[PDB]
Design an enzyme around this catalytic site. Structure first.
Site, PDB file in Angstrom:
ATOM      1  N   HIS A  41       0.038  -2.573  -8.451  1.00 52.24           N
ATOM      2  CA  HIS A  41       1.210  -2.863  -7.670  1.00 52.24           C
ATOM      3  C   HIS A  41       2.384  -3.262  -8.528  1.00 52.24           C
ATOM      4  O   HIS A  41       3.434  -3.605  -8.047  1.00 52.24           O
ATOM      5  CB  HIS A  41       0.918  -3.861  -6.570  1.00 52.24           C
ATOM      6  CG  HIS A  41       0.659  -5.239  -7.053  1.00 52.24           C
ATOM      7  ND1 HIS A  41       1.609  -5.988  -7.694  1.00 52.24           N
ATOM      8  CD2 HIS A  41      -0.430  -6.022  -6.954  1.00 52.24           C
ATOM      9  CE1 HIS A  41       1.109  -7.166  -7.992  1.00 52.24           C
ATOM     10  NE2 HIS A  41      -0.127  -7.210  -7.553  1.00 52.24           N
ATOM     11  N   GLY A 143       3.500 -14.210 -10.800  1.00 53.85           N
ATOM     12  CA  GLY A 143       3.417 -13.795 -12.172  1.00 53.85           C
ATOM     13  C   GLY A 143       2.049 -13.956 -12.769  1.00 53.85           C
ATOM     14  O   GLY A 143       1.835 -13.606 -13.890  1.00 53.85           O
ATOM     15  N   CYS A 145      -0.518 -12.409 -11.684  1.00 52.63           N
ATOM     16  CA  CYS A 145      -1.259 -11.202 -11.450  1.00 52.63           C
ATOM     17  C   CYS A 145      -1.691 -10.642 -12.770  1.00 52.63           C
ATOM     18  O   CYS A 145      -1.040 -10.818 -13.760  1.00 52.63           O
ATOM     19  CB  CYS A 145      -0.410 -10.182 -10.730  1.00 52.63           C
ATOM     20  SG  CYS A 145      -0.352 -10.371  -9.025  1.00 52.63           S
TER      21      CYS A 145
END
Lengths: 300, 5
Positions: A41, A143, A145
Site C-alpha cells: 500500500h 510510519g 508500516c
C-alpha cells in the site's frame, strides 16, 4: 529467578531494516539478499486507499518510482513484483548484513518479537502474541508500516509478521512474509473490525506453571477437574477449550513442578470462579495469556 | 475504518 515479558535480541533484524519512499509516503522495508519487502500500500495515496485496485495502481509505476535508502545510501531498484499484499523490489546490492532466515506463518497463540521501526530506523523491541482473532496488541504509530515480527532459533531468524494497519480498537493487522494477511483483513481503508477475541488457555496454564516455578503457590489446591468439566467453565468465561494435545504440550512443565495438568486446571477453575481477591501472581493482577509453554521453558 | 501505518 524471575519472569518477565522478554524479546529476542534484535540485532540481526536491525541489519535488514531499510526505508522505502514512494510518492509522499515513507515506510520501512525489509532487505534480505537482493530483495526488499514492504507493504503493497506504499503506492497508495490520500485517496487510493479509499478503494484501490492494486494491479492498476502497480503498472503506473516503475523502479524509479521507489526510493530505497539504506542508512544514508540510496539503493537501486531494478525489479518490482507483487506477492499478495506485499511488494517485492529487487535491488542491485545483495545485503552483506543478511542473516540465516526463513519465512513462517505464525499460528494463533504463538508469540513473536516486533521491531518497531520508523523511517528505516529501529525504534523499539517488544513481545507480542497473535490473538485468536488474528490481531496483535502492539504499539504502532503511523510510519511503522513495514515493521516486522520475528522469532529466532539460535542463529536463524524466522519472520512471521509485517505491519500494515490499525484497527478501530487500536490493535494491529498485518501479513506474513508472503503477503498473506493474518485474519480476513484486507488492505483497504474501509471499515473493518476485530472479531470478538478469546483467552488463550494453554498460555495461562503455562504461566501458572512459571509462577509455581517462581515460588508463588497460593492458588494451588488438592482438587482435580475433568477435561470436560473444566471446559464447561472455560466456555463460561470466554476461555478457549483445553484439548488433549494441549495437555500433552504441558507435560514437561507439569513434570518439573510435579503438578498434574488437570489439577492446575482445577486451580484455574477456582481462580476463574473466585478471582484473586487482591492477590498477585508473578506480580500480576489478572491471568496472563501471552506466554507460550515454550516461552516459559526458555525462561526457566 | 482501518488506518494504514
Amino acid at each position: 529467578s524471575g519472569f518477565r515479558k522478554m524479546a529476542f535480541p534484535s540485532g540481526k533484524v536491525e541489519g535488514c531494516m531499510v526505508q522505502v519512499t514512494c510518492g509522499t509516503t515513507t515506510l520501512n522495508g525489509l532487505w534480505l539478499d537482493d530483495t526488499v519487502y514492504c507493504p503493497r500500500h506504499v503506492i497508495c495515496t490520500a485517496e487510493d486507499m479509499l478503494n484501490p485496485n492494486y494491479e492498476d495502481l502497480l503498472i503506473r509505476k516503475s523502479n524509479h518510482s521507489f526510493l530505497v535508502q539504506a542508512g544514508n545510501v540510496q539503493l537501486r531498484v531494478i525489479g518490482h513484483s507483487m506477492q499478495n499484499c506485499l511488494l517485492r523490489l529487487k535491488v542491485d546490492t545483495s545485503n552483506p548484513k543478511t542473516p540465516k532466515y526463513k519465512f513462517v506463518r505464525i499460528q494463533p497463540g504463538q508469540t513473536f518479537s516486533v521491531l518497531a521501526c520508523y523511517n528505516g530506523s529501529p525504534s523499539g523491541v517488544y513481545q507480542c502474541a497473535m490473538r485468536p482473532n488474528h490481531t496483535i496488541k502492539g504499539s504502532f504509530l503511523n510510519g511503522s508500516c513495514g515493521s516486522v515480527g520475528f522469532n529466532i532459533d539460535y542463529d536463524c531468524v524466522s519472520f512471521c509478521y509485517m505491519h500494515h494497519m490499525e484497527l478501530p480498537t487500536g490493535v494491529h493487522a498485518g501479513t506474513d512474509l508472503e503477503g498473506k494477511f493474518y485474519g480476513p483483513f484486507v488492505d483497504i481503508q474501509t471499515a473493518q473490525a476485530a472479531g470478538t477475541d478469546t483467552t488463550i488457555t494453554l498460555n495461562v496454564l503455562a504461566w501458572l506453571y512459571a509462577a509455581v516455578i517462581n515460588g508463588d503457590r497460593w492458588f494451588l489446591n488438592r482438587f482435580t477437574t475433568t477435561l470436560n468439566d473444566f471446559n464447561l467453565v472455560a466456555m463460561k468465561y470466554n476461555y478457549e477449550p483445553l484439548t488433549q494435545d494441549h495437555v500433552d504440550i504441558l507435560g514437561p512443565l507439569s513434570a518439573q513442578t510435579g503438578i498434574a495438568v488437570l489439577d492446575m486446571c482445577a486451580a484455574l477453575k477456582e481462580l476463574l470462579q473466585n478471582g484473586m481477591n487482591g492477590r498477585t501472581i508473578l506480580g500480576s493482577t489478572i491471568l496472563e495469556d501471552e506466554f507460550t509453554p515454550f516461552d516459559v521453558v526458555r525462561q526457566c | 475504518s482501518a488506518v494504514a501505518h
